[PDB]
């Protein structure tokens, strides 16, 4: 049928427009945005704390600084590095040489279906053990805060402060699982899938949002400082968006042609 594509708006047609025929029945509605995104998926894998921690310093950190790495996980589909927001995803193709290796993460499915510009939704978290018959706990604090770092002495046994606080802490039995849901607590109204502004008024890095996440999570062993074991331990984190919404179209990744 004759038409002009330069106008931008083109009306969708059917088989009957130019030939003899008829339209098909609806079928099913599995493409609904709310129904599509309510499925759990892996996000990151982190270690388990066995003592009081030292939060990593900002990125301009030079050598020789003492801190703990790979113990904290951010809750956000965007790329991150060293437990802090980033802009470019990383990958170590040559595990050799000096220097500490930076943790990295990303939400492959979310960015494979990230066809829009802005997003908002609640979020449900779950954790799972990767070691046989392990006892652990999980802690959390909201966006725009920091982790207290010190300990107290009870009966000559040091006890880290992160045991107590008015922000959720949860315990699981031998081989159990931890589950709960969180609200949308960032100051911004919506989470930007892609951004092009600056946060600070000067010396800022363009395109790096400040508070595009839900919070922060970590795991620890409920024992005093006197029982620091000899082997490292790991856990896995699962997230699941709930009651999602989208606001403005965009484009999808570039599938390279061999």
């Amino acid at each position: 049928s004759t038409d002009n594509a330069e106008t931008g708006v083109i009306e969708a047609g059917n088989t009957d427009t130019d030939f003899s025929g008829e339209l098909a029945a609806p079928g099913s509605n599995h493409t609904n945005v709310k129904f599509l995104f309510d499925r759990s998926r892996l996000l990151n894998v982190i270690k388990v704390l066995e003592k009081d921690a030292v939060f990593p310093r900002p990125f301009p950190t030079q050598e020789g600084a003492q801190q703990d790495d790979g113990y904290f996980c951010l809750l956000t589909p965007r790329p991150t590095v060293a437990s802090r927001p980033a802009t470019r995803f990383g990958l170590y193709a040559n595990p050799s040489g000096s220097g500490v290796l930076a943790n990295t993460s990303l939400d492959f499915n979310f960015y494979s279906l990230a066809c829009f510009t802005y997003f908002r939704s609640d979020l449900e978290v779950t954790v799972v053990s990767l070691e046989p018959d392990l006892e652990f706990a999980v802690g959390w604090f909201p966006s725009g805060s920091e982790y207290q770092a010190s300990s107290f002495v009870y009966d000559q046994l040091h006890v880290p402060f992160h045991f107590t606080g008015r922000t959720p802490r949860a315990f699981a039995s031998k081989g159990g699982k931890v589950s709960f849901v969180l609200p949308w607590n960032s100051v911004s109204s919506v989470l930007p899938v892609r951004w092009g502004g600056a946060s600070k008024l000067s010396s800022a890095t363009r395109g790096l949002p400040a508070h595009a996440d839900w919070g922060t999570i970590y795991a620890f062993v409920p024992r005093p400082n006197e029982k620091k074991s000899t082997a490292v331990k790991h856990v896995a984190v699962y997230i699941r968006y709930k009651n999602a919404r989208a606001w403005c179209p965009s484009m999808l990744p570039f599938r390279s042609y061999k």
Partner: protein, 230 residues
Amino acid sequence: GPIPTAPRENSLMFLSTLPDDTVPAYGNVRTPPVNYLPGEITDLLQLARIPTLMAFERVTYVPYVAVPTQFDDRPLISFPITLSDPVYQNTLVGAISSNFANYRGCIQITLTFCGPMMARGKFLLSYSPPNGTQPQTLSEAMQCTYSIWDIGLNSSWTFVVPYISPSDYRETRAITNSVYSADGWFSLHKLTKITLPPDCPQSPCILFFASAGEDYTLRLPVDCNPSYVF
């Protein structure tokens, strides 16, 4: 008194896709209003129904095709109808479809002529259901479903691929060429040579767009391929 009950064999299991909620932890939160943002998307079909540019090989890829001047009986260009085929790879229809397993409805194709206003010509578009061998001449093409499009004032012309299938729903990827994945070919034929006045550039170019139809539908989500990050 206590209510006596017996848990089933399925207890303490963690199922990712389970259709139910869980226990809250930090409720009673109130959030800013979002009335000010326009253009809320309710279904991804709204985006699947927007035309986009396809790709071809210039031997190293371009969206358009250059009309030659030589005379031959082979089709000017022909590609299969299979959403996993490279030509549809980067278009929205294909990109979204690769995340599901089945589809219905009618696909839509659009063209636009971007040559000098002084040119004149005609083209033939045909769609051939599956056969032992694909069409290779105008005489064969005429018999299948086809239409004639002539250059005039208006620049674009839309074509609809009917949904003719032996079964409801069809696979969106072709591990093997069963009748449920591949559905024939599409080919374009130059009916008459182009006429141009003296002192004009030769070899005009033609452009392609691909989009979903009115009655298009998807179903049965599936996990996605992360190879793009490399």
